[PDB]
Structure 1
Amino acid sequence: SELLVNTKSGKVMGTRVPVLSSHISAFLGIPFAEPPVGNMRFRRPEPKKPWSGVWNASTYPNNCQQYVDEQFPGFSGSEMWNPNREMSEDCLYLNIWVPSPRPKSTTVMVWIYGGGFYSGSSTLDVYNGKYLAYTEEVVLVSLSYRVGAFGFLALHGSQEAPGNVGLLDQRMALQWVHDNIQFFGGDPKTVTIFGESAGGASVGMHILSPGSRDLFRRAILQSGSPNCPWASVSVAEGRRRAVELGRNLNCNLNSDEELIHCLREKKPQELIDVEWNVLPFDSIFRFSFVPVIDGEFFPTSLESMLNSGNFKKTQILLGVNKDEGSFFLLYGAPGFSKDSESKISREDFMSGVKLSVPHANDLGLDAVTLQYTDWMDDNNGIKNRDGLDDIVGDHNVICPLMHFVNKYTKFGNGTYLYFFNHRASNLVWPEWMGVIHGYEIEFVFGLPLVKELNYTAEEEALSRRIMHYWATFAKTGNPNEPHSQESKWPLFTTKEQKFIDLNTEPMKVHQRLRVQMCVFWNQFLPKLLNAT
């Protein structure tokens, strides 16, 4: 049978699903690890032990325990990102979409969800893999990993809570794919890992971590990179936050052993209720439990590894959205509202930059302000809003990524860069937010192809070329179909630094994506902050 597959861990039974007038096979909620429960919370994952009988893989699994956004109750804009399945610590599962009839040795793409390392689910409607698997005839896998304290509590030295376990969950899902995907018609030698934001940072992390390199062929990073300021913390900072979590829960803080034991006895929701209290400052775009630069998953600092070429040399395709920062200003900065133009007063602009660049000293704050302020027109609320939008996006996503792409390209085997700037026709968010963080995903996954979703014909066309770019890249390491009549996406080279826009208009090639501001964020500001 097409739906019955025997894996190295046991048999599995999938389901036939409809997809754009055709059908495809789906294996949902396949376990790849032992439930990280009880005494295993905070521990490295362990391989799922073989089960006997047939595993029913006809329904989505549970979502990992995570904070749930209740800012706009009933609002689809925010809720599409919340867990749409019951939450449980028993959440290490993966989903697979296989073309029907089953391919022989086809390209595999593994999706890693984002959510700032504190949230995310593999089961969201936007991650529904059937459209891309069907359309580009690839074997699509969506994995899952522990988020929040459950995935990244880090007490360096301890082997009960080392930190980086969510990254290890991802790796185990990758090992599972390397071991069993051939049984689904996938080629373990041609797997592309791709993810957005936290997922994108994750992808870059596996490119960096020796232990992950050999488990995939190449990578796609969307709106995220390993070096993002919010994507990792030092062992010290990580230890401090773990201990602060204990303090907030009245825990015995005498030894890791006791602290951890105390934390293992709490119900998930108790950890989550206090999750945000351990952050260093009042800030936006900062999350409590994230990867730690441990000297293990990451041999040395990310900068030194990037500098020395100490990472997987392959082909990468990556990019950003025009307004990565808007989502975060809306939720944490004064003056922003989803029901108004959100014109920002100079006073709010000032507090906005402090929130946005929490680690900066006064001189640092002044530099950012000067860099993003039009002094001929400083009370212009729109320029103030947009200025703050750019600050959040440039500092958190765009510049860290440009740094990564420039460093990576010195050693890599091909880099393709994009700038996604199409504002969807059916977007429920206010216009000031622009091309929002995460909204290129529905195009990557082919959502615009489903008519009931009411996207424009130009949007369906954009989705199809994006899916083909992504897939062709996954298959060959080049988004372009060699000798083809269509415009060509040029390689990003260290000299020319070319990149293309991704929208409904004919392709435009540009150079040096936001160089000016990124020179400020990547070179000058760090120099000024180091000064003292």
Structure 2
Amino acid sequence: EDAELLVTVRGGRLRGIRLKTPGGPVSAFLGIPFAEPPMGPRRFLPPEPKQPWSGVVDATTFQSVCYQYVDTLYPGFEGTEMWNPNRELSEDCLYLNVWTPYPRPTSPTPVLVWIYGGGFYSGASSLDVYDGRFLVQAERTVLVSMNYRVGAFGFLALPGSREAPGNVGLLDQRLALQWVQENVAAFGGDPTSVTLFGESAGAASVGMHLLSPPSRGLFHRAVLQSGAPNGPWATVGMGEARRRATQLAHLVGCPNDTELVACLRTRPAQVLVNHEWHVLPQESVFRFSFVPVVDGDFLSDTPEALINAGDFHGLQVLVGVVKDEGSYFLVYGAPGFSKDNESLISRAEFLAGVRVGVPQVSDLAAEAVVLHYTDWLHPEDPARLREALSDVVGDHNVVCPVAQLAGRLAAQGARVYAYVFEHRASTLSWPLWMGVPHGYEIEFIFGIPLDPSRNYTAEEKIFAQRLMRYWANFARTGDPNEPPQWPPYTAGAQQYVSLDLRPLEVRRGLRAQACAFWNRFLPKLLSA
């Protein structure tokens, strides 16, 4: 037996596996339990640490995915299946993974912690596209990813109740981050240089760990990719959380908060998932039923409030977006859209879709959106209309939330780096009109193009290697630049770089004209 694949952590002994890379061998420890299974009476409760075990836990394959809705819109389509669970669903799912160089490192090695996205209703650390092996081998880091509860199992909140307090999925993450502090050295990781990185809801979660003091001592640097804690989708108010938890109970035959959660706990997990989307107040895209709740505990104020009031000196942050953040979401409810035609919508469809992409606002607010995103020299051009609705959804949900976070953090002491990821993968199966859709920079950051079994080009492999260098430099030093150069983002100059097969190009403003509308004006209108 290979001693490099035996590790003792505080709970007990683990047996790992050796994995091949086009470069060298990597050690992987998959399916390490870090919490007690949140089953039965423990559904909806904060995670409790994993009791220690005798014998040797076999950490040789991915454990199960937390219960979640499965995309069925395009059965068999690679563009959606790559995000669907690739292991059995279980509520017994709070496991984490460690990838480390082979043999295990000598000296403390810098640690990357990955938090997956998926709108807080979906995701898993087992997905192919989050494979740690390439970053570990190429950039000599230790990489940890964790599963955390999603949907109602992670974020159903009856605020004030002991029985369903909310944010427990967030607490899953924190527990994993605590686990990393106490055990990562056993694998050669340096617990004093831990960098959090995530995408979609994972980037929102990274941000929430920045703004929650108990989490803030658990890591040192942050990367937020196409997501932010201040997005209109990433948090919910106490009342709406209570209304949504309550409508779910009604939809599954339930039933006193205690009597209500008690009844929810007797229902099969899959039953809750089947009614997940029906709790939403409105037909929408880019809105999700059970997300983090602002109740004064995990988040003492709204993420936007906490950003504006924070002393962020001594923090380095890497943030960015892809070119076409909003595109794919349109085929999940915007009238006239499809992945299978050109989606050249009519003006009436555009106006309809504006209410789907910016839900729950006054008619005045909708008109203000229609005003900003219309070219009044071409009010009915279908191609321009498709592009504008994509820009509405992308600006409203990702780009302008991210721009606000970056600018406020920068103006309040943080060193910020910003990127726009502008390369469309040669392997992409979504239509060409979707551009670079939300999420399709992750495969390059994780180095997936280096897999020979996959058919990327020679330039994409080099591109992936550049990206891994940028991210790893940021982890080690707080600066993505190699020790043409990538400048910090400031509230004034608003400089960012474009990542593609061409060399770095520095540009100004993350959609500054649009994001003035969403960040500066539209809040004021909504208060009157």
Q: 1:407 is matched with which residue?
A: 408
Distance 2:129 2:4 in 1: 26
3-state SS, counterpart of residue 379 of structure 2 = coil
Give 1:385 deviation, angstroms: 0.3
Are positions 1:507 and 2:504 aligned together?
yes
Per the alignment, residue 527 of structure 2 pairs with 530
Instruction: Tell me how far 1:313 sits from its aligned partner.
Output: 4.7
Structure 2 equivalent of residue 43 of structure 1? 45
From the superposition, tell whether residues 333 and 52 of structure 1 become closer, same or farther in structure 2 (CA, over 3 Å).
same
Q: Give the SS at the match of 1:47.
A: coil
* 1:183 and 2:186 matched: yes
**Equivalent position to 1:101, from 81, 92, 103:** 103
Which position in structure 1 is the counterpart of 2:145? 142
Aligned residues, how many?
Answer: 525
Shift of 1:379: 1.8
Whether the 8 Å CA contact 1:206–1:213 is kept in 2: the answer is yes
Residue 220 (structure 1) aligns with = 223
Equivalents in 1 of 2:312, 2:259: separation in Å? 37
- For the residues of structure 1 that align with 2:84 and 2:165, how far apart are their CA atoms? 28
C-alpha change, 1:311 and 1:209, in structure 2 (3 Å) is farther
Aligned partners of 2:181, 2:243: CA distance in 1, in Å?
36
Match of 1:497 among 467, 489, 494: 494
1:208 partnered with 2:205? no
* CA–CA separation in structure 1 for the residues paired with 2:46 and 2:15: 28
Please tell me the residue identity of whatever aligns with 1:240: R
Aligned to 2:399: 398
The letter of the residue matching 1:385 is: R
1:128/1:449 CA distance change after superposition, 3 Å: same
1:316 maps to 2:317: yes
Aligned-residue CA RMSD (Å): 1.0
1:123 matched to 2:126: yes
* CA displacement 1:51-85 (0-9 Å, x = unmatched): 11111000110000000001111111100100000
Preserved contact between residue 28 and residue 95 of structure 1 (Cα < 8 Å): yes
Is residue 370 of structure 1 aligned with residue 358 of structure 2?
no
**Which ranges of structure 1 fall in alignment gaps of 5 or more residues?**
none
Aligned to 1:12: 14
TM-score norm. by structure 1 comes to: 0.97
Q: Does 2:176 correspond to 1:173?
A: yes
The match for 1:196 among 190, 194, 199 is 199
CA distances 1:463-493 after superposition (whole Å, capped 9, x unpaired):
11110000010011111122xxxx1111112
How many angstroms does 1:312 deviate by? 8.1
| 1:39-438 correspondence runs (5 A) | 39-103=41-105, 104-252=107-255, 255-309=256-310, 313-438=314-439
> Could you list the runs of 5+ residues in structure 2 that have no partner in the other structure?
none
Seq. identity, %: 59
Instruction: Check the 8 A contact 2:311/2:413 in 1, yes or no.
Output: no
- Structure 1: which amino acid aligns with 2:339? K
SS in 2 for 1:295: coil
User: C-alpha distance in 1, partners of 2:118/2:516?
Assistant: 27
Q: For residues 329 and 482 of structure 2, what CA distance do their matches in structure 1 show?
A: 37
Residue 312 and residue 297 in structure 1: after superposition, are their counterparts in 2 closer, same or farther (change >3 A)? farther
What residue in structure 2 maps to residue 519 of structure 1? 516
CA–CA distance in 2 between the matches of 1:38 and 1:203?
A: 29
Distance 1:370 1:91 in 2: 47
Question: Aligned to 2:129, what secondary structure does the other structure show?
Answer: helix
Report the Cα distance in structure 2 between the residues aligned to 1:313 and 1:246, rounded to whole angstroms. 45
Q: Distance in 2 between matches of 1:367 and 1:313?
A: 39
1:26 Cα offset (Å): 0.4
Q: Is the 8 A contact 2:321 2:420 kept in 1?
A: yes
Say which is worse superposed, 218-227 or 370-379, in terms of deviation.
370-379
Deviation at 1:310, TM superposition (A): 5.6
Distance 1:239 1:154, change over 3 A: same
Determine if contact 1:210/1:311 at 8 Å carries over to the other structure.
no
